Amino acid sequence: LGDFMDKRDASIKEQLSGVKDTSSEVKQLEEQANAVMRAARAEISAALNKMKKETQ
C-alpha cells in the first residue's frame, strides 16, 4: 500500500513538473518566434539599407 500512496502522489506530482515544463517550453517558443520574426525584419532592413547606399 505504501507504493500506492507513492504512485498516486508521484504521478500527480509528475504531471505538475510536466505542466511546468510545457509552460517553460511555450515561453521559449514565444522568444524564438520573437527572434525569428525580428530576424527576417532586421535582415531586410540591413540588406536594403546597405545595398541602397552602395548602388546610390
Binding site: 500527480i12 504531471q15 505538475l16 510536466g18 505542466v19 510545457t22 509552460s23 517550453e25 511555450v26 517558443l29
Partner: peptide
C-alpha cells in the same frame, strides 16, 4: 493534474 496536462499540451500546440 490531468486538466493541466491537457490544457498545457494544447497551449504548446497553439504556440508551435
Amino acid at each position: 493534474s490531468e486538466e493541466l496536462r491537457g490544457k498545457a499540451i494544447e497551449q504548446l500546440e497553439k504556440a508551435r
